[PDB]
Structure 1
Amino acid sequence: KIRTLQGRVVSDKMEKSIVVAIERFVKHPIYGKFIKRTTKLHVHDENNECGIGDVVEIRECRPLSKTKSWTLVRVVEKAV
């Protein structure tokens, strides 16, 4: 019962870290239409157990660096 977010992975070139393209379904305040405003983050990737195009679940932890504030807990649907 810990607040977590699930999203794709876009880049793995950085050492021991990845990025997550969190996607959501937000309703427009004015026109009342549902859109997809994505959100990018920097997630710690100890042991580099991830890959590009993979679905991951993350967790909010202490800031590891200037842009790092999230860490992963597992990996699911390791599509190639």
Structure 2
Amino acid sequence: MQKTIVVELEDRMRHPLYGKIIRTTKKVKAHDEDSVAGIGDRVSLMETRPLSATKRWRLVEILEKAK
């Protein structure tokens, strides 16, 4: 995507009524001025100003790069 990375975020939160812990996933889009990140590659992000129409995150560091 030419200097843009797409990262999937998962979060768990109690069900409002039944009380079960439900797991849900998001998909944010992050910025790479120097595009080096592949599939897998657990990463850390920090949310920023509207760098684009849909981008609000910037890549910080690629920790435990993919196997």
TM-score (norm 2): 0.91
Write the distance in 2 (CA, Å) between the matches of 1:62 and 1:43: 11
Does residue 75 (structure 1) correspond to residue 56 (structure 2)? The answer is no
User: 2:37: which partner in 1?
Assistant: 50
Q: Which runs of 4+ in 1 moved over 4 A?
A: none
**Residue of 19, 23, 29 corresponding to 1:36:** 23
Question: Which runs of no fewer than 5 residues in structure 1 stay unpaired?
Answer: 1-13
More strand by share: 2
Amino acid at match of 1:47: D
Answer yes or no: is 1:15 the counterpart of 2:2.
yes
Alpha-carbon distance in structure 1 between the residues aligned to 2:39 and 2:33: 15
Aligned-pair identity (%): 52
Q: CA deviation at 1:58?
A: 0.5
**SS of residue matched to 2:11:** coil
Counterpart code for 1:69 = R
TM (norm. structure 1) is 0.77
